[PDB]
Amino acid sequence: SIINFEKLGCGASIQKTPQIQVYSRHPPENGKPNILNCYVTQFHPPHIEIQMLKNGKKIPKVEMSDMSFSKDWSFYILAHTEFTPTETDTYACRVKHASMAEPKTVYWDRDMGPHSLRYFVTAVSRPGLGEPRYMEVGYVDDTEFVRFDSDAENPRYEPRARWMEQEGPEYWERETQKAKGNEQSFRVDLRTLLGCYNQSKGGSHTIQVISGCEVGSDGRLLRGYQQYAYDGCDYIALNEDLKTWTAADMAALITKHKWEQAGEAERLRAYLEGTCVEWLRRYLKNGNATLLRTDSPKAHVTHHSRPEDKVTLRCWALGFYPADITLTWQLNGEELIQDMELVETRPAGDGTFQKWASVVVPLGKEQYYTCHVYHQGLPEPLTLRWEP
């Protein structure tokens, strides 16, 4: 259960480039149906246009994940489409974003314990196009379990995991109505931040909050979060002592001084130590079965033939959960950290993740290299070698 937010009240009335990977859900064999993904990350502002192209031409039925953002405030989203890969068909993903002069097209190539309850809030103004879009997204240990999105005709808190369905009607009504009250607080703050940052009234702007608690096995609060960003930059944050605020710039000093006078750190302390902890506990009971599951990586090495007497070994980790993983190549028992290539961990789209690490080795020397896979679901690290 998210807190009811206090208005920022900063006083009476910057862009990040997307990163793109394009890859299939399952290893591509020609003729068999599959899923092509276009994973876009690290971008701000959140408005973005993503097209998937087949042989130069737009692909019509392209589904898209709901948009999320990460602890560094940048947004991310998964686009995907069904496709049956063939030998000569070319696929690609094209991204239009205000941080880029021109749309970026990225082609697909067929080779190359403690617990937390956190809420991720977004409010984006859209002058001329509608009311600000407001979202609340709840995560129990990085698993999304509830969501409120204002862009519906009758906005409602929705379960996002089957184990939330057992909460009664009284719960969803209370959350829904708290969300609509929260929505109005951010609408007012979006108006007000314009003056505070001396901005024009026709531009789109963004408020983001991360709010919640991390709780140890003993049931005691390990860390509390209440941090705000305006246009993708720190604005204000409760300190680890849960008594004082860190204001990232001058406009936030007005909010801080105000929240000091109002005792807002103390209201947060109480929510964080009590209410947040107690609800986390409740969501853990409901989700007991599913939330604790891990899936360990199945790994394998692939071989790719380069110019001259160099070859590339690629080490793959597929179908693992959670996303945290380490891949390393070794030669003679030393790690080749400084000369190997790797991709950012990426969702398969069925709820699990993929990663690979590659190294360039001499032709005929493939059996001198060993790949290591470290994942928390493994009883023991995996060790693998290329094999024909």
Numbering used by the authors: 1 to 13, 24 to 122, 143 to 418
What's the publication's text?
Major histocompatibility complex class I (MHC I)3 molecules present a diverse array of antigenic peptides, the so-called immunopeptidome, to circulating cytotoxic T lymphocytes. Here, endoplasmic reticulum aminopeptidase 1 (ERAP1) and ERAP2 trim peptides to the optimal length for stable MHC I binding in the final editing step of the antigen processing pathway. The construct consists of SL8 peptide linked with β2m and Kb HC in which the C terminus of SL8 is tethered to the Kb-binding groove through a disulfide bond between Y84C of Kb and a second cysteine within the peptide-β2m linker.
To avoid complications arising from consequent lowering of the macroscopic off-rate, we utilized a disulfide-linked SL8/Kb single chain construct (WT-SCT). To confirm that the A-pocket mutations did not disrupt the general architecture of the peptide-binding groove of Kb, we determined the structures of WT-SCT and its three alanine-substituted variants by X-ray crystallography. In line with the structural similarity of the backbone between WT and variants, the previously identified hydrogen bonds between (i) the terminal amine of S(P1) and the phenolic groups of Tyr7 and Tyr171, (ii) the backbone carbonyl of S(P1) and the phenolic group of Tyr159, and (iii) the amide of I(P2) with a structurally conserved water molecule (Wat1) remain preserved in all variants. By contrast, no difference in the levels of WT-SCT was observed when ERAP1 was expressed. By contrast, WT-SCT showed very little difference in B3Z stimulation when ERAP1 was present.
